Amino acid sequence: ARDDEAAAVALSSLIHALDDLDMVAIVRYAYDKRANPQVGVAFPHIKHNYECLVYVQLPFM
Amino acid sequence: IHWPCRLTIGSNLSIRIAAYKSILQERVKKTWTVVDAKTLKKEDIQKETVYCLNDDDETEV
Amino acid sequence: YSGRDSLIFLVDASKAMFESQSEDELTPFDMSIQCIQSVYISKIISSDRDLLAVVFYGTEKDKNSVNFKNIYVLQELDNPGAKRILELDQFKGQQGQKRFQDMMGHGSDYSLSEVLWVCANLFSDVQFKMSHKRIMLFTNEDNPHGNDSAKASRARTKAGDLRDTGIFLDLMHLKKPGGFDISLFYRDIISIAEDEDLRVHFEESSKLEDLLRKVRAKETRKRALSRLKLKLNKDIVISVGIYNLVQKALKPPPIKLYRETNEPVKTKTRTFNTSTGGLLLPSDTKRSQIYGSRQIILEKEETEELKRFDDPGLMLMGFKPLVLLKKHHYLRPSLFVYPEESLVIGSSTLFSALLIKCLEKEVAALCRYTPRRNIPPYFVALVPQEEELDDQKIQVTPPGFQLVFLPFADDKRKMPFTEKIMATPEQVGKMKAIVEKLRFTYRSDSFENPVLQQHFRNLEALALDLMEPEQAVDLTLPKVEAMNKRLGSLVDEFKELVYPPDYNPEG
Amino acid sequence: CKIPALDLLIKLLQTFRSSRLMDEFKIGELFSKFYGELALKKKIPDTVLEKVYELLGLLGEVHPSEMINNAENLFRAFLGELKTQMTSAVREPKLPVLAGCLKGLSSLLCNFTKSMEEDPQTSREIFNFVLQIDLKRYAVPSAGLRLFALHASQFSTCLLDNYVSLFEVLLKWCAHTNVELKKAALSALESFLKQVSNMVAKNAEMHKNKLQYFMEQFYGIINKELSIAIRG
DNA sequence: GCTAATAAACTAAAAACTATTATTATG
DNA sequence: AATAATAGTTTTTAGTTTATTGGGC
């Protein structure tokens, strides 16, 4: 989120570490009170003007 | 619409974030209205639900 | 379809099964009956459409229509019902055990031919097609009918007989001081293709854990989602099967049922002329959409011809390198296509050839896809997925083509993103160290839906009238204290490395 | 609502064919209720259940005015669904059971209504007129033939066109197999010929179609055809 | 101070995959 | 006087409804 440039630098370091290590982050997402929390995969997306992580939902057994 | 929240890491780190459903499915933003064939209005067009008695009857439940 | 499943459960109604090596341990009767509860619960969760039965032997009574002594049927092959579960629970535990032993005999001589007879008859009664003539029993002795050579002979004769009729049987090891004496009397009478001749297994040694464990999946059968055709060149057209190896779950439909009867009410909902209180007609329906001044009126077949673009099918658009797709161009969950020869025979040869070639080519198959009638076509890519095996040569990945979906231009929603920000390599090293601290080898099936699981707990506890709904454990909760101890001070080290120590990440 | 229900419908149908004005009066209530259950726009019922139209095809009573006041509504619904049916744009010019059901319904109900007074007459003529290919003894063409034959008069003043095509289609249909289809075509033939003779007799243009249409084919008739030609 | 996305739950909706059978042929 | 083409069985699946933060002054 904007106005937290320290969080921006932290996110950038996260992205760089993911690139170097070829890691992908397993995460738990809960949209709101009445949306079911669920599991997805987060991987970085990098463009010259922005680096970002991309969340994709994942299934259960 | 973005998702301004705070990603929690372990037990001591939190990062304000802004998610975006950048890729999305395609669906019409204008629904279809079934108006009357004569008045061309839906005001006379409304549903009547009947939970007809599941026994040897037809009274709405 | 290819058949259904059939299985019966047999229990030695004898005092040797109501005892234990140390009575603090469960009696074989008690462990067996609770395992049956577990199995039936698993069936109700998963495949209650199958038919399940229970019969006794050794009890000093018999209920079989055969009327052979000590052969007391409990239940016929029936779909697992809560009533059956309660019938089991009234005698489960080592007090209902005593109540059973009171109202029901326990411990007497008999021949195995009798129980084999009655179970064969029970299988013969059901008219449906069963793909598995499975037989289950619970005992840890092989001597009492090997004690009499005539009993042993007839038992093994009938065992070979039922094997001839394709009947399958299995026994779990039960807790005995002596044991069922592996291969003393059960190495040919039992239809086995494996070997465990390492211990008479006086102790229990079996898959009972999985039998007593409860899976929460439906595991529906294998169905061809579609046999839709590829329009290669509009002349050569191929038949292929459509499948997914994963399906987003759901909840059972809410059966609306009447209050003082619990009876689901047949319900009819319809529109009507609200202006006069009259009843409308399907012709009365006029589809409409208002834009500014004019409201525009259309019909149903009009509403589908605008949706009509081309026949249901696959239209090959060309070849594209696999690398030319970035994973952030993701869409609805990917599908898979398998070759088939139901109409287009020889097409599987083509499928194999193209699979191998584009695997060497390292390119995807770009196609134009119409699922169904009056459906627009869409851009789709076919990555060649290779048949992947294991030590057991099991298709951990089957052959064919994984179906992925190409988002369109409108699908993109470019955010008002800000600039790009870098970070120092020391922070990157901090992150690498932290990742290795909290490294976790991925495993797909290590997770379920806590909402799904808890709603189950509610459902089966409700039907079972439990002292509480089961406390479903959420695997998706990260063990926060475990990561704290697994990281140490690296958290705050990197925090002060990046975050201004005065400035908390909290506003 | 299945073979049980269908057999029940068949039973009460044959009852009304037998029973005539002894207790044929506790039907108007039932007539309204079948209109309502037909007004259940849910697509749950099977096409076989659409034999319900023969149910509403009614001739066992005087049909009090309310029957008429709903009959036109029924008719319009059937016309709309037919407009849906023939449009091969849905890939379907198909209506497997529907055709005979609505045929019988309009057979029993046109007895009370719909003389030549308006365009709707010509409209229903046309929807019948579209009668391509069928299967399994080709019941739908026979249904159309009976339907037209019973109410040929209610089709006058709009049969004066396409007579060449109508005529030859009739000839081939009776020439075709499925002797039920043959006799249906025969009946439709005689009804058509009588009606056109009646209109021609009262014309002033009778000479045109007379000398331009008839003696040539009548000569050209020279199996069963001749006999019909004899009447012709 | 006003009332816009929104995923969730809820409908209908079409195909798979049934098992069944009116057919013509033929005596 | 026989064989044949043809039914909903579920099962996904794709519009609907709602009760949800949001821009306003």
UniProtKB/Swiss-Prot annotation, chain B:
Subunit structure: Heterodimer composed of XRCC5/Ku80 and XRCC6/Ku70; heterodimerization stabilizes XRCC5 protein. Component of the core long-range non-homologous end joining (NHEJ) complex (also named DNA-PK complex) composed of PRKDC, LIG4, XRCC4, XRCC6/Ku70, XRCC5/Ku86 and NHEJ1/XLF. Additional component of the NHEJ complex includes PAXX. Following autophosphorylation, PRKDC dissociates from DNA, leading to formation of the short-range NHEJ complex, composed of LIG4, XRCC4, XRCC6/Ku70, XRCC5/Ku86 and NHEJ1/XLF.
Official protein name in the record: X-ray repair cross-complementing protein 5
Misc. remarks from the entry: Individuals with systemic lupus erythematosus (SLE) and related disorders produce extremely large amounts of autoantibodies to XRCC6 and XRCC5.
Induction section of the entry: In osteoblasts, by FGF2.
Residues modified to N6-acetyllysine: 21
Notes concerning its domains: The EEXXXDDL motif is required for the interaction with catalytic subunit PRKDC and its recruitment to sites of DNA damage.
Entry comment on modification after translation: ADP-ribosylated by PARP3.
Encoding gene, per UniProt annotation: XRCC5
Similarity section: Belongs to the ku80 family.
Function in brief: Single-stranded DNA-dependent ATP-dependent helicase that plays a key role in DNA non-homologous end joining (NHEJ) by recruiting DNA-PK to DNA. Required for double-strand break repair and V(D)J recombination. Also has a role in chromosome translocation. The DNA helicase II complex binds preferentially to fork-like ends of double-stranded DNA in a cell cycle-dependent manner. It works in the 3'-5' direction. During NHEJ, the XRCC5-XRRC6 dimer performs the recognition step: it recognizes and binds to the broken ends of the DNA and protects them from further resection.
Modified positions (Phosphoserine) in chain numbering: 11, 14
Organism ancestry: Eukaryota, Metazoa, Chordata, Craniata, Vertebrata
Subcellular location(s) of the protein: Nucleus; Nucleus, Nucleolus; Chromosome
Swiss-Prot record, chain C:
Residue(s) carrying Phosphothreonine: 424
Positions of region (DNA-binding): 246-310
Gene Ontology MF terms: 5'-deoxyribose-5-phosphate lyase activity; ATP binding; ATP hydrolysis activity; ATP-dependent activity, acting on DNA; cyclin binding; damaged DNA binding; DNA binding; DNA helicase activity
Superkingdom of the organism of origin: Eukaryota
Keyword Cytoplasm in annotation: yes
Subunit and partners: Forms a heterodimer with XRCC5/Ku80; heterodimerization stabilizes XRCC5 protein. Component of the core long-range non-homologous end joining (NHEJ) complex (also named DNA-PK complex) composed of PRKDC, LIG4, XRCC4, XRCC6/Ku70, XRCC5/Ku86 and NHEJ1/XLF. Additional component of the NHEJ complex includes PAXX. Following autophosphorylation, PRKDC dissociates from DNA, leading to formation of the short-range NHEJ complex, composed of LIG4, XRCC4, XRCC6/Ku70, XRCC5/Ku86 and NHEJ1/XLF.
Role: Single-stranded DNA-dependent ATP-dependent helicase that plays a key role in DNA non-homologous end joining (NHEJ) by recruiting DNA-PK to DNA. Required for double-strand break repair and V(D)J recombination. Also has a role in chromosome translocation. Has a role in chromosome translocation. The DNA helicase II complex binds preferentially to fork-like ends of double-stranded DNA in a cell cycle-dependent manner. It works in the 3'-5' direction.
Record protein name field: X-ray repair cross-complementing protein 6
Organism: Homo sapiens
Gene field: XRCC6
Part of the whole protein covered: 32 to 538 of 609
Swiss-Prot record, chain D:
Subcellular location(s) of the protein: Nucleus; Nucleus, Nucleolus; Cytoplasm, Cytosol
Superkingdom field: Eukaryota
Ranges that cross the membrane: none
Post-translational modification: Autophosphorylated at two clusters, the T2609 cluster and the S2056 cluster. Autophosphorylation induces a conformational change that leads to remodeling of the DNA-PK complex, requisite for efficient end processing and DNA repair.
The HEAT repeat ranges on this chain: 161-196
Role this protein plays: Serine/threonine-protein kinase that acts as a molecular sensor for DNA damage. Involved in DNA non-homologous end joining (NHEJ) required for double-strand break (DSB) repair and V(D)J recombination. Must be bound to DNA to express its catalytic properties. Promotes processing of hairpin DNA structures in V(D)J recombination by activation of the hairpin endonuclease artemis (DCLRE1C). Recruited by XRCC5 and XRCC6 to DNA ends and is required to (1) protect and align broken ends of DNA, thereby preventing their degradation, (2) and sequester the DSB for repair by NHEJ.
Subunit structure as annotated in this protein's UniProt entry: DNA-PK is a heterotrimer of PRKDC and the Ku dimer (composed of XRCC6/Ku70 and XRCC5/Ku86). Formation of this complex may be promoted by interaction with ILF3. Component of the core long-range non-homologous end joining (NHEJ) complex (also named DNA-PK complex) composed of PRKDC, LIG4, XRCC4, XRCC6/Ku70, XRCC5/Ku86 and NHEJ1/XLF. Additional component of the NHEJ complex includes PAXX. Following autophosphorylation, PRKDC dissociates from DNA. Interacts with DNA-PKcs-interacting protein (KIP) with the region upstream the kinase domain.
Family according to the record: Belongs to the PI3/PI4-kinase family.
Protein name from the UniProt record: DNA-dependent protein kinase catalytic subunit
Span of the entire protein shown here: 123 to 365 of 4128
